[PDB]
Amino acid sequence: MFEARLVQGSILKKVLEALKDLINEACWDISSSGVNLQSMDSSHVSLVQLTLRSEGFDTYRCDRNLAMGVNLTSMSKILKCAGNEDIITLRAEDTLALVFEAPNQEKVSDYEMKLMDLDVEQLGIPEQEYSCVVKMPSGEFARICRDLSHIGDAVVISCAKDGVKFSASGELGNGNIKLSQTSNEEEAVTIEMNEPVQLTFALRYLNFFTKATPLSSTVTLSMSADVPLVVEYKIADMGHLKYYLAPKI
Amino acid sequence: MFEARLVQGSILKKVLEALKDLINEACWDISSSGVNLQSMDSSHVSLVQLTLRSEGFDTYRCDRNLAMGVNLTSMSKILKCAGNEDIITLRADTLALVFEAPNQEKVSDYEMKLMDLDVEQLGIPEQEYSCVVKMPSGEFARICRDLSHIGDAVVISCAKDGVKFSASGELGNGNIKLSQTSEEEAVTIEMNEPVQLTFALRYLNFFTKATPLSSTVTLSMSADVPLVVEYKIADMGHLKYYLAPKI
Amino acid sequence: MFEARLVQGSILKKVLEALKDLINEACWDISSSGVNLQSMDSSHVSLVQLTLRSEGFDTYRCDRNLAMGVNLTSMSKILKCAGNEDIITLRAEDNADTLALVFEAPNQEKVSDYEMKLMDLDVEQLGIPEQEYSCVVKMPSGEFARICRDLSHIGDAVVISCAKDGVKFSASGELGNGNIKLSQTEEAVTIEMNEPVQLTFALRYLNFFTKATPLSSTVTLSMSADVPLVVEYKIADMGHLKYYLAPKI
Amino acid sequence: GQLTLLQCGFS
Amino acid sequence: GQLTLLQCGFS
Amino acid sequence: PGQLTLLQCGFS
């Protein structure tokens, strides 16, 4: 018996939109502490980590630890049947029930999604400290990645103490975008770094990551020389959604 | 000489938008009492019945009865050339449509070709229904669209205090339970004898294109008889849809 | 050295959207008096003439007459990376095969440099025969666009007959025929006319023209017996976008 | 699977 | 029978 | 060398 009641159900809708484009199928580790998800994509180039603390739910029970393998494309498709103001319950007792209560309480929706059997495979995250940390509006990071993807396939990220630069080159020319550190709510840009860093990443994966933009007004970039990028979105007060991206040479 | 003036012209656009996908071509019966359209779909699995009373227009003159064969897709294409708050005049082997802007300073005139095709006289048997469900047209559209992402067919189970919609498919199965409410936004169940019937979501999704015409919808059922879905156009008439069941 | 700063950068965005669909590649005549663009389409039935006065720019410097050959499709794709309220600077250096475009975010500290490749072309010197018109019609650009899209769902060609009474647009086609009659009343319809004129034009090309509709609330139609139509949109107070369309017998 | 209206008493 | 602009005195 | 994988960056 697992059952978790989420009043602001749009969170689950958004989380699966942030995952389906990158991961077709993944394994949910449910426990008393909450729900937890880690998976690399097929090409082993990126890693997504989902954390939802049980305290962020309005009701939570979990008798034994479970590990549900779910086709995320199927679960996303079911969650699109839920309204944005619905209250959503995940329930399990080889099937995953999802119950969508309209705000009225006169409409109730029950979906039973078949589960799938997956190889549980433990991911080793090496331990790592980051020179450069960039905090910036999530909406502008989305626009930066989307625009430069119309110029090239890869973006060169150069962080200096006073500003960060995004560059791409392609067959119709090349462009760069410079953000300065602000001195200003949730549209500020603040850099805290040690000494200059330059890394090259694939815009293809970054635009997968930015499907998480509806989850937060800000986004956090963590970098160091020759180590994967981390982009993390904080979910309201329940957890986060981290993406790791290996660099290009 | 036939001539009918409709002030809130948007009605016609919505009506044809409700017919074009289900009936490719149909025959309009004009008379002194108003307009009427009946047609089965190609596969004889559904039927649409349209009623527009002459009293609902602001000018109406039909000295004698007509039978116009119209390509509905052709007629839909033309009505999208009318604005949403425009005033529409139908005049009548050609069918004229006249579009008056609000200010009556832009005016449009279209002559539509007709079709020589035979008017149908369909026999609808007399029936009334174990279950009648009245509910917002929006909720019912959404119910059909959601379950169509799960299966191709929906099982409707009417009991006295609630109605259940079920589908099943490759990726799982779903159910939607509606309770009696207790406004304009009510859900009403009136049951004599419980009923469960199975219908094709494809045709229901054709039907709910009439949603812009009315805030509510009425569902009528009985054992082994076609479903009826009825939308009431403002106070001028209705659009009834019949759908035979599966089993 | 060419440099032109445009505060209302949206003008460039709109101008390119109105040009790319008709002209694949064109030559910018840059001079001290401003920017200037002329081209016939491939099939030689229409001509577009663009005017941007140097006085219309916040800043304008042009050390010598230039003739920059630009891929308009490529330039539209770069201008799509600019926001609608961005400040846009064009800059052409010493010699370079590149035209720089700079997008200044208005509110925050964000700046974007794009370097576009240029192409060499000989400027077509086009002769416009010298002409004055029987009928001149001025009317809202929104209604003219909607007129053209509507009538194109009936036929390939439109018949324009203005009387100082009113102007009539007619089309016939595979499902019937329709006409639209405009009467004399931003919001107004104005006719200034001579002898009656009736001309037939291809709705395909006019719907290319109305791609310029976002540039102005009104549009001017100029006709005379057996001579090409002129469709003109005034750009805010710096210039215009003129279109010529030959008639059909 | 699917019935027609002609199998439901219509004409 | 669409004319070209070169058939209307243009070059 | 191209694009690295996370396994080439010390991950498992």
Numbering used by the authors:
A (entry chain E): 1 to 93, 97 to 187, 191 to 255
B (entry chain A): 1 to 92, 97 to 186, 191 to 255
C (entry chain C): 1 to 185, 192 to 255
D (entry chain B), E (entry chain D): 797 to 807
F (entry chain F): 796 to 807
Lines from the paper:
ERCC6L2 (Excision Repair Cross-Complementation Group 6 Like 2), also known as RAD26L and as the HElicase mutated in Bone Marrow Failure, HEBO24 is a poorly characterized member of the Sucrose Non-Fermenting 2 (SNF2) family of ATPases25 associated with a distinct bone marrow failure syndrome. ERCC6L2 accumulates at centromeres and promotes deposition of core centromeric factors. Beyond centromeres, ERCC6L2 facilitates replication at genomic repeats and non-canonical DNA structures. Notably, ERCC6L2 interacts with the DNA-clamp PCNA through an atypical peptide, presented here in a co-crystal structure.
